[PDB]
Design a binder for this molecule. Structure first.
Ligand SMILES: CC(C)CCC[C@@H](C)[C@H]1CC[C@H]2[C@@H]3CC=C4C[C@@H](OC(=O)CCC(=O)O)CC[C@]4(C)[C@H]3CC[C@]12C
Ligand SMILES: CC(C)CCC[C@@H](C)[C@H]1CC[C@H]2[C@@H]3CC=C4C[C@@H](OC(=O)CCC(=O)O)CC[C@]4(C)[C@H]3CC[C@]12C
Ligand SMILES: CC(C)CCC[C@@H](C)[C@H]1CC[C@H]2[C@@H]3CC=C4C[C@@H](OC(=O)CCC(=O)O)CC[C@]4(C)[C@H]3CC[C@]12C
Ligand SMILES: CC(C)CCC[C@@H](C)[C@H]1CC[C@H]2[C@@H]3CC=C4C[C@@H](OC(=O)CCC(=O)O)CC[C@]4(C)[C@H]3CC[C@]12C
Ligand SMILES: CC(C)CCC[C@@H](C)[C@H]1CC[C@H]2[C@@H]3CC=C4C[C@@H](O)CC[C@]4(C)[C@H]3CC[C@]12C
Ligand SMILES: CC(C)CCC[C@@H](C)[C@H]1CC[C@H]2[C@@H]3CC=C4C[C@@H](O)CC[C@]4(C)[C@H]3CC[C@]12C
Ligand SMILES: Oc1ccc(-c2nnc3n2Cc2ccccc2OC3)cc1
Ligand SMILES: Oc1ccc(-c2nnc3n2Cc2ccccc2OC3)cc1
Ligand SMILES: Oc1ccc(-c2nnc3n2Cc2ccccc2OC3)cc1
Ligand SMILES: Oc1ccc(-c2nnc3n2Cc2ccccc2OC3)cc1
Ligand SMILES: Oc1ccc(-c2nnc3n2Cc2ccccc2OC3)cc1
Ligand SMILES: Oc1ccc(-c2nnc3n2Cc2ccccc2OC3)cc1
Lengths: 367, 367
């Protein structure tokens, strides 16, 4: 029996104080508070969300890219758990976590207003946000699945928040197929030699692709000039992670350049600035396309090229080719813990952004 | 000659990469990058904003609470600068900063669309946000003015962002006057003895006032139940700082309680939880009032009481009574650098929130 304005503010205050409590626990942990205390806290929050989901289901009883999105990242998370399962907080957390993931997908697939529902969904938003934060701050198969569990817990947090926020074609695919074959070659050569040559190859390949995407998107923008809020916000919020990764690399490269060090190399400076520029241009192209016969064929070739390039760029870190963690300079300017966390944020965000863009470019291409 | 959607996204991307660059510099500094490099970076950004403001002015040539808000906090900032003025980056920064503050107030008072204006205002938003972040991370008069320069640089950042986001009465004043006289007594007694007794007095006084405000706001909510977006967002965003301060204190108090330490005291646990509860209740009361004869007199007495209590609570940290920095427990669980930064965020946010609430309660009272 609350006014809607009070139901929304009270739910927001509950959720934000839940986040700030998680923040307090994480700060206390890094500085009395042990890993078991943070795991126990989030485990309890998952148990609370599970109780809400069960009660909700009892009371109740072109999105294929999004449903297949979280179903794949949840299956990958369940695989990760299965590996971890096979202190009390460490022993219990993966069980509650697996149940949380299973119920979270079941609910979002089939059961996606009262104050009960608003508190439930806000709780879920900040539970998944805290799960992201924990995945980022805290056998060998757990390495490759790491970005997929983290992007699972940022995707689902967005999926839950935005739910209530609302409430001829020749050159394109040829360039795309070449970029994909080259990306696969870079991926396998890098993994086989897991060395320095493969890293340099990776960065030169990256620069070449980022420059080609800048040209493609710029051409599309010129065509539009001479002649959906959530998609823009999701592209920008996700790309911010990669823009921090890039600015950290740029700052470290400039700091090295200022000393006239013999180790300075343009491949760690031009690439990061190019990543920021290309993403700014692509974000503007994609949103312009979403707010909209030679021009049609040109735009289709551009979207097909960018689509394929974004898939190839998603593929690189998605399959284990993440050399940024081993950078000899960024791990000295910021240290290993800061560089590692910045990448732990940026990489799963970069995977999200590179598959978001692929879905938006696909839609633009079809129409 | 940009579409409005592209003008807004491109400006947002410029501003956010400006923030992420400032983030990169601050991380690099804490971990190659010295204080002079961060001061130089922000000094240059202030010079850029000054150039924009001059070009803009050349091209061009119930808000009294807000205009008097930033005019007072800018005069206090100029006083702080005057004290600092009387490495090259340290010598130059206060001059550019003073000019920035003077032009920022001149512009906001008298000169508060083209892409030029959008890039200019977004730059100013993230320049002031970076200035806040620097004031928080990095004679004796500089102590007392510290929260006012920091809240200046968070107030003005909000003032600039929201600009474009938009584009009978017996018991009340008697309780208020008693709360004010008691707050002044606590303030002067604390400062005179600048000791442990004054701190305990402060915390017991705080708890007594927070409980009285909870009763007042709860009564007002009951009256409304038995019978403006930016204001809600500013109250919540500002109160978040105090909710982090409170949860850090609560976590430290619980960690101490879990060890059965003889030093555990309820005054550091009940107060922080009460601060969170009272603010949640008051935020819901104020927004309910903004979205709206015995009931009228009751509501006027409640608003008058809360108005006076929020002034008294603003007065306590505003005049130097900030004992939270000396807490013997929160500075051990989180360390001195983390507890100090959490308070450097929360206190100027608490001052903002406690004068925001006073302006909203004043408006509600008059009508
Ligand atoms: C962007 C929104 C949605 C918030 C999500 C991220 C937060 C949960 C992040 C932001 C800043 C993070 C903190 C930033 C700073 C620190 C201090 C740092 O402390 C040290 O490592 C100090 C080491 C020493 O000197 O002993 C460790 C990480 C920690 C606790 C981080 C934990 C998680 C925080 C609160
Ligand atoms: C919301 C946007 C517009 C603001 C930009 C900043 C945020 C996106 C924050 C939230 C998550 C933060 C990161 C999360 C955690 C850390 C941990 C911290 O590293 C450590 O945990 C250990 C410190 C050490 O011992 O070196 C360094 C800061 C960093 C990378 C933070 C950098 C700033 C981030 C990206
Ligand atoms: C909320 C939005 C609007 C962003 C505004 C705040 C950011 C500018 C904050 C968020 C997290 C902050 C960082 C969090 C973590 C660190 C790591 C910390 O590093 C250490 O102290 C490690 C010490 C050591 O182990 O040697 C110092 C502060 C710093 C750089 C902070 C600098 C400023 C950051 C990026
Ligand atoms: C946007 C909301 C909903 C997310 C909640 C977190 C944010 C509000 C961030 C931005 C500013 C952050 C703070 C800014 C800086 C620091 C510095 C850091 O302390 C240090 O600088 C030194 C670390 C050490 O050596 O102990 C500890 C984290 C803390 C308090 C951060 C805690 C989390 C805050 C409040
Ligand atoms: C559209 C699909 C691909 C979505 C994401 C699924 C990902 C996580 C799957 C796809 C195929 C998998 C890879 C194929 C085989 C190898 C070689 C081995 O030595 C290390 C693991 C590794 C490298 C696997 C890791 C996980 C993997 C990358
Ligand atoms: C509405 C007004 C008050 C807005 C804010 C102005 C503030 C910053 C002004 C008001 C009066 C001032 C105080 C009055 C006198 C003293 C005693 C001296 O030993 C330390 C400084 C100190 C404690 C001053 C600090 C700054 C001050 C707190
Ligand atoms: O056949 C597939 C299906 C999905 C993915 C995938 N994996 N992660 C993500 N998606 C999809 C997605 C959809 C919308 C917005 C963002 C986003 O990014 C997350 C991969 C292969
Ligand atoms: O990989 C990503 C990263 C960020 C977003 C995103 N973009 N806008 C929003 N989020 C997420 C979010 C989550 C919890 C609370 C607030 C909040 O803010 C809304 C999406 C995908
Ligand atoms: O450099 C970055 C920048 C942003 C993130 C990030 N990822 N998810 C979230 N943010 C913060 C954010 C930014 C805009 C809107 C909402 C929101 O909240 C959730 C990470 C690294
Ligand atoms: O006579 C005065 C006038 C202003 C202040 C003051 N000082 N700081 C702040 N204000 C005012 C204010 C107004 C609207 C929203 C927030 C807010 O908070 C900032 C004090 C005495
Ligand atoms: O003391 C405060 C603290 C926060 C707010 C506030 N509330 N909502 C917003 N801000 C400020 C802001 C500043 C820069 C970029 C984005 C942004 O987000 C909007 C106000 C007063
Ligand atoms: O515990 C806290 C929580 C928040 C802040 C803070 N202060 N100013 C800003 N935030 C972050 C924020 C939160 C909501 C909307 C915008 C926004 O951005 C600016 C500080 C301490």
């Amino acid at each position: 029996k609350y006014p809607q304005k009070n139901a929304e503010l009270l739910s927001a205050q509950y959720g934000t104080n839940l986040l700030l409590l998680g923040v307090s626990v994480m700060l206390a942990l890094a500085a009395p508070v042990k890993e078991e205390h943070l795991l126990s806290f989030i485990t309890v929050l998952m148990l609370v969300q599970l109780v809400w989901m069960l009660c909700y289901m009892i009371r109740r009883e072109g999105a294929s890219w999004i449903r297949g999105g979280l179903t794949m990242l949840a299956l990958l998370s369940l695989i990760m758990d299965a590996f971890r399962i096979g202190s009390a907080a460490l022993g219990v957390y993966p069980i509650v976590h697996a149940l949380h993931t299973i119920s979270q997908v079941h609910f979002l697939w089939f059961h996606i207003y009262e104050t009960f529902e608003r508190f439930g969904v806000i709780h879920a938003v900040f539970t998944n946000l805290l799960l992201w934060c924990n995945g980022v701050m805290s056998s060998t198969s757990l390495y490759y699945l790491y970005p997929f569990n983290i992007e699972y817990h940022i995707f689902v947090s967005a999926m839950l928040f935005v739910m209530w926020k609302n409430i001829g074609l020749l050159l394109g695919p040829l360039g795309g197929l070449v970029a994909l074959a080259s990306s696969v070659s870079v991926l396998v050569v890098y993994l086989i030699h897991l060395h320095e040559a493969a890293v340099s190859m990776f960065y030169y390949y990256g620069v070449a692709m980022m420059a080609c995407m800048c040209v493609g998107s710029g051409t599309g923008l010129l065509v539009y000039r001479m002649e959906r809020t959530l998609d823009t916000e999701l592209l920008l919020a996700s790309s911010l992670g990669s823009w921090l990764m890039s600015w950290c690399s740029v700052v470290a490269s400039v700091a090295e350049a200022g000393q006239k060090s013999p180790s300075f190399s343009w491949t760690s400076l031009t690439y990061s600035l190019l990543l920021v520029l290309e993403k700014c241009i692509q974000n503007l192209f994609i949103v312009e396309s979403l707010y909209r016969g030679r021009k049609r064929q040109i735009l289709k070739n551009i979207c097909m090229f960018l689509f394929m390039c974004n898939i190839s760029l998603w593929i690189l870190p998605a399959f284990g080719c993440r050399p940024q963690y081993d950078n000899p300079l960024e791990n000295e300017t910021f240290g290993t813990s800061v560089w590692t966390t910045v990448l732990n944020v940026a990489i799963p965000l970069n995977l999200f952004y590179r598959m978001h863009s692929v879905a938006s470019l696909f839609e633009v291409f079809r129409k």
